[PDB]
Amino acid sequence: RKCNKLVPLFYKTCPAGKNLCYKMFMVSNLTVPVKRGCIDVCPKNSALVKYVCCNTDRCN
């Protein structure tokens, strides 16, 4: 599967060695949208980057 989104106008896929996907943003740093990538596990988030992890069609 792949992630059909990463930013407000971006999209990308992944290999078979990853697991899900997550759009990494900032906490009120810029605005909300920033970037995204693949993932292997999704525990919790942090107070520095918005780790929006998901395994839906927009990720896994």
XYZ file of C-alpha atoms in Angstrom:
60
model
C 0.000 0.000 0.000
C 1.118 3.651 -0.186
C 0.282 7.092 1.239
C -1.685 9.232 -1.239
C -0.816 12.360 0.779
C 2.040 14.026 2.685
C 1.432 17.778 2.482
C -1.575 19.783 1.140
C -0.575 19.066 -2.481
C 1.784 16.051 -2.262
C 1.504 12.236 -2.423
C 3.975 9.299 -2.357
C 4.256 5.504 -2.021
C 6.448 3.131 0.013
C 8.322 -0.170 -0.334
C 7.360 -3.484 1.316
C 9.814 -3.009 4.209
C 7.895 -0.158 5.883
C 4.535 -0.398 7.701
C 2.297 2.704 7.754
C 2.715 6.462 7.100
C 2.567 9.720 9.094
C 2.428 13.409 8.167
C 5.047 15.159 10.324
C 4.146 18.804 11.005
C 4.940 21.375 13.727
C 3.106 22.620 16.844
C 1.915 26.092 15.781
C 5.410 26.568 14.309
C 4.325 27.150 10.693
C 0.587 26.526 10.208
C -0.216 22.790 10.214
C 0.934 21.206 6.934
C 4.652 20.366 6.586
C 5.689 16.865 5.422
C 5.050 13.103 5.767
C 6.928 9.775 5.507
C 6.632 6.013 6.131
C 6.582 4.358 9.574
C 7.170 1.037 11.371
C 5.257 1.717 14.612
C 3.012 4.513 15.950
C 3.269 4.951 19.726
C 2.518 8.563 20.745
C 3.342 12.091 19.516
C 5.612 14.864 20.851
C 5.373 18.597 21.636
C 7.593 19.508 18.662
C 6.310 17.647 15.579
C 2.711 16.694 14.749
C 3.139 12.953 14.134
C -0.172 12.133 12.398
C 0.336 8.374 11.906
C -2.222 6.234 10.034
C -2.483 2.922 8.191
C -5.432 3.857 5.937
C -5.214 4.205 2.125
C -3.382 7.489 2.787
C -0.639 5.482 4.513
C -0.762 1.656 4.607
